[PDB]
């Protein structure tokens, strides 16, 4: 109830992102699909097939039910496995691969990132898109320097000092009211990611902050904006939303 606006905002951003890169009869691969909270958004997008994959069986389970009890028109598929630090071969390619609030987990180790980016590349059709929403390292480090690493909605704490450069840290603890607790998150080495992808035939096509992206899409699509209590957002709520950014790669 307290994090309602944040959730609405986030779903909105995801709904818009999905809208911008999907078209009818499209095939989507949803990595880190969680409980399938995007099936509805994809239903409206008129997609033909949806493949959800998540490492946590408990989430893939709730996702199966959601798809099982919803009025959808697309063919669904779910699989509980590791799509980042373990090889993945679903035997097919998709038009759109989506990774919402999950791809930063692929930065566990250099090997994990490599495997992860390779699972993406072999499942993406030539011309396909890989849309994602990941925490922004720049934002997070800049907030660290300002001493504002938290509020009543969330809380973040980095690694140990002891001559350790602020740029040396690779992970941090993240907590979100009514959500994850002391969740270990890995920073997104942006450049390494771009490089890894550029080497697999995928190039950066988009990078925009949640807040900015939010403002733009809401002032362009006042329609889907009325579908919920959008419009404004307190300062404390923006803190949380302002953590993530939109990144979109494309397979030439
Ligand atoms: N290697 C991996 N493969 C697939 N999912 C992973 C993963 N590591 C972490 N995750 C998943 O990442 C998800 C992040 S939150 C899931 C939210 C969902 N994409 C949404 O848009 O609401 C969790 O469900 C977690 O289990």
CA of 30 to the centre of ligand 1 (A): 9
- Classify strands 75-79 and 154-157 as parallel, antiparallel or unpaired: unpaired
CA of 145 to the centre of ligand 1 (A): 29
Give the CA distances from residue 229 to residues 47, 218, 225, 233, in Å, rounded to whole numbers and listed in that order: 26, 12, 8, 10
Cβ neighbours for 41, distance < 8 A, ≥ 6 positions apart: 11, 14, 15, 18
Q: Which of 132, 125, 108 is nearest to 204 (CA)?
A: 132
Resolution for the entry shown, Å: 2.5
Residue nearest to atom 5 of ligand 1 (CA): 32
Tokens of 174: 């993240």
Q: Which of 250, 251, 252, 233 is nearest to 242 (CA)?
A: 233
CA distance linking residue 42 with residue 49, whole number of Å: 9
Q: Which of 207, 205, 73 is nearest to 139 (CA)?
A: 207
Phi-psi region of 213 (alpha: psi -120 to 50; beta: other; left: phi over 0): alpha
Query: Which mutation among 7, 10, 55, 243 tests ligand 1's pocket best, with the greatest number of atoms within 8 A of CB?
Result: 55
Domains belonging to the chain, first-starting first, are 1-252 (3.40.50.150)
Q: Which residues line ligand 1 (CB under 6 A)?
A: 14, 31-34, 37-38, 53-56, 59, 82-85, 100-102, 105
Alpha helices in the chain (DSSP H): 4-21, 39-44, 57-68, 110-121, 137-146, 190-198, 210-220, 222-226, 235-241
CA of 40 to the centre of ligand 1 (A): 18
105 is in an annotated binding site: yes
Cβ neighbours for 19, distance < 8 A, ≥ 6 positions apart: 45
């Amino acid at each position: 109830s307290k994090t309602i606006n944040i959730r609405n905002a986030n779903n909105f951003i995801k709904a818009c992102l999905i809208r911008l890169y999907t078209k009818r009869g499209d095939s989507v691969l949803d990595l880190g699909c969680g409980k399938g909270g995007d099936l509805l958004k994809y239903e409206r997008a008129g997609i033909g097939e949806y493949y959800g994959v998540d490492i946590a069986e408990v989430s893939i389970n709730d996702a199966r039910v959601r798809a099982r009890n919803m009025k959808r028109r697309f063919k669904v598929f779910f699989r509980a496995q590791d799509s980042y630090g373990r090889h993945m071969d679903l035997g097919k390619e998709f038009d759109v691969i989506s990774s919402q609030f999950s791809f930063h987990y692929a930065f566990s180790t250099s090997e994990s990132l490599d495997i992860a980016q390779r699972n993406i590349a072999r499942h993406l059709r030539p011309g396909g898109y890989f849309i994602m929403t990941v925490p922004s390292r720049d934002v997070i480090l800049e907030r660290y320097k300002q001493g504002r690493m938290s509020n009543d909605f969330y809380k973040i704490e980095l690694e140990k000092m002891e001559d350790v450069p602020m740029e040396s840290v690779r992970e941090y603890r993240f907590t979100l009211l009514d959500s994850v607790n002391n969740c270990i998150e890995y920073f997104v080495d942006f450049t390494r990611m771009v490089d890894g992808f550029k080497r697999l035939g995928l190039s950066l096509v988009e990078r925009k902050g949640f807040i900015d992206f939010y403002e733009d899409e809401g002032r362009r699509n006042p329609e889907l904006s009325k579908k919920m209590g959008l419009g404004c957002l307190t300062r404390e709520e923006s803190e949380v939303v302002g953590i993530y950014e939109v990144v979109v790669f494309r397979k030439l």
